[PDB]
Write an enzyme that holds these catalytic residues in place. Structure first.
Site, PDB file in Angstrom:
ATOM      1  N   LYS B  44       0.829  -1.217   0.000  1.00  0.00           N
ATOM      2  CA  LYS B  44       0.000   0.000   0.000  1.00  0.00           C
ATOM      3  C   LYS B  44       0.867   1.273   0.000  1.00  0.00           C
ATOM      4  O   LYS B  44       0.341   2.360  -0.214  1.00  0.00           O
ATOM      5  CB  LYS B  44      -0.950   0.011   1.218  1.00  0.00           C
ATOM      6  CG  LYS B  44      -1.884  -1.206   1.336  1.00  0.00           C
ATOM      7  CD  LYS B  44      -2.673  -1.234   2.665  1.00  0.00           C
ATOM      8  CE  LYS B  44      -1.869  -1.625   3.899  1.00  0.00           C
ATOM      9  NZ  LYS B  44      -1.341  -3.024   3.829  1.00  0.00           N
ATOM     10  N   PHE B  85      12.871  -5.796   3.453  1.00  0.00           N
ATOM     11  CA  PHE B  85      13.886  -6.605   4.106  1.00  0.00           C
ATOM     12  C   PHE B  85      13.254  -7.494   5.202  1.00  0.00           C
ATOM     13  O   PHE B  85      13.499  -8.702   5.212  1.00  0.00           O
ATOM     14  CB  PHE B  85      14.997  -5.686   4.691  1.00  0.00           C
ATOM     15  CG  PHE B  85      15.713  -6.141   5.947  1.00  0.00           C
ATOM     16  CD1 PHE B  85      16.334  -7.389   6.006  1.00  0.00           C
ATOM     17  CD2 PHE B  85      15.849  -5.286   7.036  1.00  0.00           C
ATOM     18  CE1 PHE B  85      17.013  -7.798   7.159  1.00  0.00           C
ATOM     19  CE2 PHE B  85      16.556  -5.684   8.178  1.00  0.00           C
ATOM     20  CZ  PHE B  85      17.144  -6.933   8.231  1.00  0.00           C
ATOM     21  N   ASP B  90      10.774 -12.410   7.469  1.00  0.00           N
ATOM     22  CA  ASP B  90       9.631 -12.826   8.289  1.00  0.00           C
ATOM     23  C   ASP B  90       8.838 -13.943   7.589  1.00  0.00           C
ATOM     24  O   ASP B  90       8.334 -14.834   8.273  1.00  0.00           O
ATOM     25  CB  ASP B  90       8.709 -11.618   8.587  1.00  0.00           C
ATOM     26  CG  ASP B  90       7.446 -11.954   9.364  1.00  0.00           C
ATOM     27  OD1 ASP B  90       7.532 -12.095  10.622  1.00  0.00           O
ATOM     28  OD2 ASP B  90       6.364 -12.071   8.723  1.00  0.00           O
ATOM     29  N   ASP B  94       8.087 -17.471   9.329  1.00  0.00           N
ATOM     30  CA  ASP B  94       6.687 -17.776   9.608  1.00  0.00           C
ATOM     31  C   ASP B  94       6.152 -18.879   8.698  1.00  0.00           C
ATOM     32  O   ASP B  94       4.979 -19.251   8.845  1.00  0.00           O
ATOM     33  CB  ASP B  94       5.816 -16.505   9.502  1.00  0.00           C
ATOM     34  CG  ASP B  94       6.159 -15.480  10.585  1.00  0.00           C
ATOM     35  OD1 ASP B  94       6.894 -15.832  11.525  1.00  0.00           O
ATOM     36  OD2 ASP B  94       5.675 -14.350  10.500  1.00  0.00           O
ATOM     37  N   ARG B  99       2.424 -13.310  -0.226  1.00  0.00           N
ATOM     38  CA  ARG B  99       2.676 -11.941   0.202  1.00  0.00           C
ATOM     39  C   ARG B  99       2.346 -11.003  -0.934  1.00  0.00           C
ATOM     40  O   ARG B  99       2.832 -11.205  -2.058  1.00  0.00           O
ATOM     41  CB  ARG B  99       4.146 -11.788   0.635  1.00  0.00           C
ATOM     42  CG  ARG B  99       4.633 -10.340   0.857  1.00  0.00           C
ATOM     43  CD  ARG B  99       4.102  -9.733   2.141  1.00  0.00           C
ATOM     44  NE  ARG B  99       4.569 -10.469   3.321  1.00  0.00           N
ATOM     45  CZ  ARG B  99       4.209 -10.178   4.564  1.00  0.00           C
ATOM     46  NH1 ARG B  99       3.400  -9.155   4.804  1.00  0.00           N
ATOM     47  NH2 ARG B  99       4.672 -10.891   5.579  1.00  0.00           N
ATOM     48  N   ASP B 161       8.538 -12.258  19.563  1.00  0.00           N
ATOM     49  CA  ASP B 161       7.491 -12.912  18.777  1.00  0.00           C
ATOM     50  C   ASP B 161       7.818 -14.403  18.610  1.00  0.00           C
ATOM     51  O   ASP B 161       6.948 -15.241  18.824  1.00  0.00           O
ATOM     52  CB  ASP B 161       7.365 -12.224  17.396  1.00  0.00           C
ATOM     53  CG  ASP B 161       6.288 -12.795  16.489  1.00  0.00           C
ATOM     54  OD1 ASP B 161       6.598 -13.718  15.703  1.00  0.00           O
ATOM     55  OD2 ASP B 161       5.166 -12.298  16.529  1.00  0.00           O
ATOM     56  N   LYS B 187       8.152  -5.117  17.303  1.00  0.00           N
ATOM     57  CA  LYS B 187       8.108  -5.736  15.970  1.00  0.00           C
ATOM     58  C   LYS B 187       7.353  -4.918  14.915  1.00  0.00           C
ATOM     59  O   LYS B 187       7.631  -5.101  13.735  1.00  0.00           O
ATOM     60  CB  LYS B 187       7.569  -7.182  16.007  1.00  0.00           C
ATOM     61  CG  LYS B 187       6.050  -7.336  16.092  1.00  0.00           C
ATOM     62  CD  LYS B 187       5.622  -8.717  15.618  1.00  0.00           C
ATOM     63  CE  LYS B 187       4.116  -8.884  15.691  1.00  0.00           C
ATOM     64  NZ  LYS B 187       3.691 -10.246  15.264  1.00  0.00           N
ATOM     65  N   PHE B 226      -2.605  -0.976  14.754  1.00  0.00           N
ATOM     66  CA  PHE B 226      -2.324  -1.516  13.434  1.00  0.00           C
ATOM     67  C   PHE B 226      -1.967  -3.007  13.486  1.00  0.00           C
ATOM     68  O   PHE B 226      -2.394  -3.752  12.608  1.00  0.00           O
ATOM     69  CB  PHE B 226      -1.188  -0.742  12.782  1.00  0.00           C
ATOM     70  CG  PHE B 226      -1.000  -1.067  11.320  1.00  0.00           C
ATOM     71  CD1 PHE B 226      -1.903  -0.610  10.368  1.00  0.00           C
ATOM     72  CD2 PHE B 226       0.071  -1.844  10.897  1.00  0.00           C
ATOM     73  CE1 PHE B 226      -1.740  -0.928   9.020  1.00  0.00           C
ATOM     74  CE2 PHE B 226       0.239  -2.148   9.549  1.00  0.00           C
ATOM     75  CZ  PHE B 226      -0.668  -1.691   8.619  1.00  0.00           C
ATOM     76  N   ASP B 230      -3.890  -6.288  12.007  1.00  0.00           N
ATOM     77  CA  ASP B 230      -3.119  -7.277  11.253  1.00  0.00           C
ATOM     78  C   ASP B 230      -3.413  -8.682  11.783  1.00  0.00           C
ATOM     79  O   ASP B 230      -3.640  -9.581  10.978  1.00  0.00           O
ATOM     80  CB  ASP B 230      -1.606  -6.982  11.304  1.00  0.00           C
ATOM     81  CG  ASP B 230      -0.770  -7.956  10.474  1.00  0.00           C
ATOM     82  OD1 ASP B 230      -0.860  -7.907   9.238  1.00  0.00           O
ATOM     83  OD2 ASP B 230      -0.034  -8.762  11.070  1.00  0.00           O
ATOM     84  N   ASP B 231      -3.471  -8.856  13.129  1.00  0.00           N
ATOM     85  CA  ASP B 231      -3.790 -10.152  13.746  1.00  0.00           C
ATOM     86  C   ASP B 231      -5.231 -10.575  13.470  1.00  0.00           C
ATOM     87  O   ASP B 231      -5.474 -11.757  13.262  1.00  0.00           O
ATOM     88  CB  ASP B 231      -3.543 -10.141  15.254  1.00  0.00           C
ATOM     89  CG  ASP B 231      -2.111  -9.915  15.675  1.00  0.00           C
ATOM     90  OD1 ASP B 231      -1.199 -10.102  14.833  1.00  0.00           O
ATOM     91  OD2 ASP B 231      -1.896  -9.611  16.850  1.00  0.00           O
TER      92      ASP B 231
END
Ligand SMILES: C=C(C)CCOP(=O)(O)OP(=O)(O)O
Ligand SMILES: C=C(C)CCOP(=O)(O)OP(=O)(O)O
Ligand SMILES: [Mg+2]
Ligand SMILES: [Mg+2]
Ligand SMILES: [Mg+2]
Ligand SMILES: [Mg+2]
Ligand SMILES: [Mg+2]
Ligand SMILES: [Mg+2]
Lengths: 340, 340
Positions: B44, B85, B90, B94, B99, B161, B187, B226, B230-231
């Site tokens: 975005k 990066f 990540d 994860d 993505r 995390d 994070k 934010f 996201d979660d």
């Protein structure tokens, strides 16, 4: 020399303490201490020691106060942290088993791919130390930019190394002397040889472009020799001495050994190398090692080590001035005839 | 706003050109261009745009010359590179699939764990751009240190995390509101919210410790909201809109959703969560989603989004001065009620 090494290692406890000093991040700071203890200790500390030794030889003893000497061993440890960051990441990408006589940090149960962030933390610690000890110094920015530029150059080198070594693809055509020299200049020579002397030079107030260019001529050549030795040891070194297991053959790497093999192989020997290089099969690796020995590559390496030493010595005679030749001679003595 | 986004994206071709300009490294520079094109485009651009919008609102228009505006969109792109990066790295850690509407860079055949070095190159490009465009500016060092500190804070956050989310271990005890707030502050909040406004502030000559502290109070709270969003979207978002597939349940993550579940669950519901959280089985993930829906967590999220917006607005009223409130209001409007 061993006493010099011992004095440098005795400063590590202070480095860890200052880096692992907000209670909410306690568990993460405890993980960073474990990341530091495991990965920055066990090596030969040649880069960290070069900073300390070069600083002492470049700075007038009346200007070598307690704070100045602390800054020197701290910047030495910053170079060791740069090395630690790249090795943790390189061991994952090379699918390595051991490092510095112990299992690779990522191979540890409970670590795995979390070692990617651990590598990033080691890199972050360099700039934390530079800020903590060198922020008020006139060379602060020169050191920041030198460590950032050294990381970029290493990463560009690692990219060339990985592009020349695709998994599952026959890459013999790509293994040229020209390609090899380019990979090792960026992936090893800049950060392992130019960085430690350049850091001590900026700390000594030697910021001259021409002086850094001259130091670079010697040090990038020394770095090329050092990587050629590293490639030889990957296959013909003692893992009890080297502390690591070789993977260059299995990983389809543009090793100095494979480049020499290709320059000396008959069409029959080329076929043997083509069918057996870049593969995980133990018998295929054993076949490549047998071909290297048939072509007397260990003897070819011994002759190169001699010729390269004389060439590096001639470069010290040409480009050392006005710096003390001992600055470059000390590092040459430490890497020549080394089997570790 | 869409025209603002379009103007920012039109500068990307110049960023790539200046970063991908030594013929020996040609193949590596060609790989960097591919790494840049794939991973810095498709998002975005909220962080990059915030730098550009905040710079315009903080700097007097007679001081907004062509070189000044170029520096602003370049620093905006540096923040996008920082994000690129961390996301590349990540996604490996994860075990993510997609993505920004496409397969993860590491999931691409021929890339794999080589994406670790690609992530490092994206990070290196930030300091290359800062040196190329901002080296002669009085805020150069402030920007270098801000990007380095933002990376360290993100990495500390990523460590928390990952430590709270061990694979194969029941970690419900660790999923507390206190732990959650600490993870998301480091994070996400520091680099996604404090970094873009702080960069424009230093470029505008606002280097005051008290001004940065006040901006931080608003922005770290905005960052927490934010990450909560996201979660929520990880499980209840549309992947065609979000561009990514959720993995928080399978990855045993300390999600805002699991923290809320644990505060509202009966002993019977706690048992259901214990037996089914942090596991790869599709039916176990479906069982956790069913429990969340039984506890009306989507409604609980809607009420939190409202309460948080009002709280953030009250913080803008308290701490925006002397900066234009529009600096913070513009970013709040862009993130509130967003489903992407
Ligand atoms: C740059 C290359 C050749 C990696 C290893 O360097 P060293 O052989 O100096 O390793 P350590 O002493 O630091 O363990
Ligand atoms: C910090 C977190 C929540 C990661 C994603 O950030 P965005 O949702 O802003 O992702 P992009 O727009 O950059 O793709
Ligand atoms: Mg290796
Ligand atoms: Mg390697
Ligand atoms: Mg090697
Ligand atoms: Mg993720
Ligand atoms: Mg993550
Ligand atoms: Mg998420």
């Amino acid at each position: 020399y061993a006493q010099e090494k011992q004095d440098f290692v005795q400063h590590f406890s202070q480095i860890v303490r200052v880096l692992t000093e907000h209670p909410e991040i306690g568990d993460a700071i405890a993980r960073l201490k474990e990341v530091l203890e495991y990965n920055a200790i066990g090596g030969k500390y040649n880069r960290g020691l070069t900073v300390v030794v070069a600083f002492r030889e470049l700075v007038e003893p009346r200007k070598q106060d307690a704070d100045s000497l602390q800054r020197a061993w701290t910047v030495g440890w910053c170079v060791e942290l740069l090395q630690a960051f790249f090795l943790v990441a390189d061991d994952i990408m090379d699918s390595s088993l051991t490092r510095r006589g112990q299992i690779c940090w990522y191979q540890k149960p409970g670590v795995g791919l979390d070692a990617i962030n651990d590598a990033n933390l080691l890199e972050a610690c360099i700039y934390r130390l530079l800020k903590l000890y060198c922020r008020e110094q006139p060379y602060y920015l020169n050191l920041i930019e030198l460590f950032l530029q050294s990381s970029y150059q290493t990463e560009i080198g690692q990219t060339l190394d990985l592009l020349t070594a695709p998994q599952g693809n026959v890459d013999l055509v790509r293994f040229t002397e020209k390609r090899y020299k380019s990979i090792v200049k960026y992936k090893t020579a800049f950060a392992s040889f130019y960085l430690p002397i350049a850091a001590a030079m900026y700390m000594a107030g030697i910021d001259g472009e021409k002086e850094h260019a001259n130091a670079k001529k010697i040090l990038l050549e020394m770095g090329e020799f050092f990587q050629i030795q590293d490639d030889y040891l990957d296959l013909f070194g003692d893992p009890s001495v080297t502390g690591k297991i070789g993977t260059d053959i299995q990983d389809n790497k543009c090793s100095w050994l494979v480049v020499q093999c290709l320059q000396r192989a008959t069409p029959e020997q080329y076929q043997i190398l083509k069918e057996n290089y870049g593969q995980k099969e133990a018998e295929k690796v054993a076949r490549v090692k047998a071909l290297y020995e048939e072509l007397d590559l260990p003897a070819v390496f011994l002759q190169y080590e001699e010729d390269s030493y004389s060439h590096i010595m001639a470069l010290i005679e040409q480009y050392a001035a006005p710096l003390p030749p001992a600055v470059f001679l000390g590092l040459a003595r430490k890497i020549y005839k080394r089997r570790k």
